[PDB]
Every structure is written in structure tokens, then in C-alpha cells.
Amino acid sequence: LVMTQSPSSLTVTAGEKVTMICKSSQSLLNSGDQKNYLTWYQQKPGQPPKLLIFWASTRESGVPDRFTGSGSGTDFTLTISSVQAEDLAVYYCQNDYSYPLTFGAGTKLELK
Amino acid sequence: QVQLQQSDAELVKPGSSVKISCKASGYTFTDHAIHWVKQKPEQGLEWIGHFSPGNTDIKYNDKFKGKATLTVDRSSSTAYMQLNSLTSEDSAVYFCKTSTFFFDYWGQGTTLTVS
């Protein structure tokens, strides 16, 4: 099971909106409980990854409203409505549906 | 607070073997599985496997079956990972982490450089 992220990297100015994509080869929708088992991690440099979103759209405790996960099935997006200096990171999507728990190659956010 | 202290950075000669530690505290050790993640030096995470303490359920990523072996010492709340036959492929930062998105605590990482 393959997770494809795009873009690999991108450069914004703080203030601007940004979108990154995560496709999976196979659907992450479990009709068991009707949730997409897709997780987003923010990893800043010199730092461990940090949970942002789980079940495609549900935002972890503490994470600002400017991060919005969407999509279902095989096609997901993460959107930062207004990028802040503190958002400089690599963003990874992880398959939390079946073993092995594969990650995307990540989208690296850089700033001007 | 919850803490995961990982062992210090390791500089090591090829075909050699290393053992990362992950000392847990501030939570009952047996509640949550320890997962291990390889961060490739450029960009990329690879899930190595997990070790559920209490229930001795140990999953490995096929990629790492043979490279990685996950032990645990319950008396001291410590997860271990051992890496064997090290090539410069294995040069990376290695993280221990708790659970699959329900508990979210990571180690500060352990760099492993192979020259």
C-alpha cells in the first residue's frame, strides 16, 4: 500500500494559503466505523513529529483552526488557511488503516 | 509530564550493530505500544515496527524484518531497538513514539551515523 504526497516541497510567504495532497493506492475508508484512517504529522527541524489531524479531518488537541484536513477514500488534502512562521516544517501523511503503517515522502514547507 | 528519553547519538563502523533505548515515564508503561520510526537524512519517515508491553504483541515492517529487533524491560519502563549489519543506508535519526494517534509522545530522537 503506497502513499503519494505532493508537492515534495513548496515555498510561501507567511500570510498566504497553502494546500498539499496525499493519494493512497487503496481506500483508507473503513465502513466498520465510516472513518478514513489517514493521519497528518508536522515535523519541524531539530524536532520529533507532532500529530496535527487524525481520521482525515479531526484536529488533535492544541492545533490551531488554520489547519484543515479533508478528503475521503484515496484522495486527501491538508490546507493551512494562513501560513505562519511557526508552520515551517515537513508535513507527512500516514496510513493508519493497515500494516505496515506507511508514510508519504512528505511535503516540505519553506518560507520567504 | 509524559517523557520518552532516548539514548545518546551513535557513530559506528559498517557491519556493526547498535541498541537504541527509550526510557518512558509519567504514564503506566503497559497501556501503550512503543512504535519506532526511521527519519531518512534528507526527508521521509519509515515505520520500523511496534512493541505492545503487557500484551507481548510485536509487529515489524517487512522492510526491517532482519535489520531491527525490538526488546523491552518492564521493571524500568524501557523499550529497546537493536539494528544489525549496519550499512550507510541505516544512517538516520531513530524515534520511539507511543501508540497510533491516541497518545502522542515522541522521543527527542537518536542519530545513528555509519562511517
Side-chain angles (χ1 to χ4, degrees), chain A residues 35 38 51-61 63 69-70:
Chain A
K35 305 197 184 222
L38 188 281
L51 188 59
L52 269 205
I53 314 286
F54 55 100
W55 300 323
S57 77
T58 306
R59 194 166 72 230
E60 168 73 351
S61 187
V63 19
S70 79

Side-chain angles (χ1 to χ4, degrees), chain A residues 29-41:
Chain A
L29 186 44
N30 158 39
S31 38
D33 63 357
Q34 279 273 262
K35 305 197 184 222
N36 307 276
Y37 278 80
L38 188 281
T39 302
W40 290 98
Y41 287 94

Side-chain angles (χ1 to χ4, degrees), chain A residues 2-110:
Chain A
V2 168
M3 309 296 284
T4 278
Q5 286 200 244
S6 75
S8 305
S9 75
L10 76 191
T11 304
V12 276
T13 301
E16 283 157 17
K17 173 154 141 152
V18 112
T19 280
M20 49 214 88
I21 291 132
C22 177
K23 270 176 214 168
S24 61
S25 56
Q26 257 101 187
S27 175
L28 302 177
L29 186 44
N30 158 39
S31 38
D33 63 357
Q34 279 273 262
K35 305 197 184 222
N36 307 276
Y37 278 80
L38 188 281
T39 302
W40 290 98
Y41 287 94
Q42 181 196 61
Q43 175 170 39
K44 306 211 214 137
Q47 289 228 297
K50 168 165 144 236
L51 188 59
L52 269 205
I53 314 286
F54 55 100
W55 300 323
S57 77
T58 306
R59 194 166 72 230
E60 168 73 351
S61 187
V63 19
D65 53 312
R66 74 169 162 283
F67 293 92
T68 34
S70 79
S72 86
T74 58
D75 281 53
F76 303 89
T77 71
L78 186 70
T79 311
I80 317 168
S81 64
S82 182
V83 171
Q84 305 296 308
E86 65 171 334
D87 295 335
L88 163 98
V90 182
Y91 296 78
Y92 294 102
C93 66
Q94 191 189 31
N95 146 46
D96 264 302
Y97 181 48
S98 53
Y99 293 120
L101 302 172
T102 55
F103 294 95
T107 307
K108 170 168 200 213
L109 203 57
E110 312 153 273

